[PDB]
Design an enzyme around this catalytic site. Sequence first.
Site, PDB file in Angstrom:
ATOM      1  N   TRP A  37       0.833  -1.180   0.000  1.00 47.07           N
ATOM      2  CA  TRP A  37       0.000   0.000   0.000  1.00 47.07           C
ATOM      3  C   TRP A  37       0.872   1.236   0.000  1.00 47.07           C
ATOM      4  CZ3 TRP A  37      -2.577   2.542   4.745  1.00 47.07           C
ATOM      5  CH2 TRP A  37      -3.562   3.473   4.368  1.00 47.07           C
ATOM      6  N   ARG A  40      -2.065   6.836   2.515  1.00 46.47           N
ATOM      7  CA  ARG A  40      -3.327   7.526   2.377  1.00 46.47           C
ATOM      8  C   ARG A  40      -3.115   8.939   1.800  1.00 46.47           C
ATOM      9  NH1 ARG A  40      -7.940   5.943   4.084  1.00 46.47           N
ATOM     10  NH2 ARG A  40      -7.020   4.555   5.636  1.00 46.47           N
ATOM     11  N   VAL A 115      -3.365  -6.285   6.222  1.00 49.09           N
ATOM     12  CA  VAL A 115      -2.769  -7.183   5.207  1.00 49.09           C
ATOM     13  C   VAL A 115      -3.451  -8.535   5.303  1.00 49.09           C
ATOM     14  CG1 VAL A 115      -0.742  -7.713   3.880  1.00 49.09           C
ATOM     15  CG2 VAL A 115      -0.638  -5.900   5.589  1.00 49.09           C
ATOM     16  N   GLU A 120      -9.323  -6.261   9.801  1.00 53.85           N
ATOM     17  CA  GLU A 120      -8.388  -5.271  10.320  1.00 53.85           C
ATOM     18  C   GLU A 120      -8.643  -5.126  11.796  1.00 53.85           C
ATOM     19  OE1 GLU A 120      -8.455  -1.461   8.318  1.00 53.85           O
ATOM     20  OE2 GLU A 120      -7.627  -0.399  10.047  1.00 53.85           O
ATOM     21  N   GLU A 125      -5.291   4.400  16.945  1.00 57.98           N
ATOM     22  CA  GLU A 125      -5.041   5.297  15.802  1.00 57.98           C
ATOM     23  C   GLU A 125      -5.055   6.694  16.353  1.00 57.98           C
ATOM     24  OE1 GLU A 125      -8.232   3.219  13.731  1.00 57.98           O
ATOM     25  OE2 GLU A 125      -6.943   3.320  11.951  1.00 57.98           O
ATOM     26  N   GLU A 215      -0.478   8.544   8.978  1.00 56.82           N
ATOM     27  CA  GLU A 215      -1.308   8.829   7.816  1.00 56.82           C
ATOM     28  C   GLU A 215      -1.956  10.218   7.931  1.00 56.82           C
ATOM     29  OE1 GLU A 215      -4.269   5.694   7.217  1.00 56.82           O
ATOM     30  OE2 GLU A 215      -2.782   4.141   7.667  1.00 56.82           O
TER      31      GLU A 215
END
EC number: 3.2.1.178
Length: 255
Positions: A37, A40, A115, A120, A125, A215
């Site tokens: 990936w 973002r 992944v 997830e 976060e 991100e």
Amino acid sequence: LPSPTNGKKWEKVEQLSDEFNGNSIDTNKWYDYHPFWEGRAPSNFKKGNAFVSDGFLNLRSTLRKEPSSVQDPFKDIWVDAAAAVSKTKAQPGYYYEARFKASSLSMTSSFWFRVGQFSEIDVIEHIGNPSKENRQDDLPYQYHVNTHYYGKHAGLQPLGTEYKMPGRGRDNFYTYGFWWKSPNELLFYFNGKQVMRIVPRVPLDEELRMIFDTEVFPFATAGVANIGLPKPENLRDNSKNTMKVDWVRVYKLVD
Ligand SMILES: [Ca+2]
Ligand SMILES: [Cl-]
């Protein structure tokens, strides 16, 4: 660690544990980017912005270019983010804990698992310093856990919860723990105390990879609020732009 279950012992999973005390990242255990990936938009992970030194895994987010130099700061890439992804898989049944201090940016400082083919697991976060001013009172104190579902389970909503910490994530090394106790039971810990529990919507019985990353969120998505874009001034300041992981330690139960 939690009390081990029923006569079993905790053993460290060496391949998923790191004191991050070496001179550079252990490439046997970690990618210093995200191999599947790019990140973002308007951020993309940059190799080596995740680096080991001074006793930490440092996840630094830097200015690729001024936001005024791109056509749309919410989309065109102008932030070089950081990621570290495990080479060994994370499994059901393990206990995971990471001790880290968040960045002081309007970006995530995250410890999570993905992944996969359908799942997830987000331990935290953390939004160290939202640029949306009316979130500065709450998000810096929030320890938010989550689960997401995709692939064959696309359409299920996320399922998570949150805990108010006594101090800001950007001001403290705190230890965030996660016991993947069953596919149907996730337990979360703050400095060694159980504080949250999630019963996932479907069994979390696939292996995942462990991730630390940063991100930009250009708007609310992926279970994260509207936080605001980061400020160049903070991205240029190495005292504010770096999430610092002192260690990650993972254990499994042995009969
Ligand atoms: Ca360390
Ligand atoms: Cl910022």
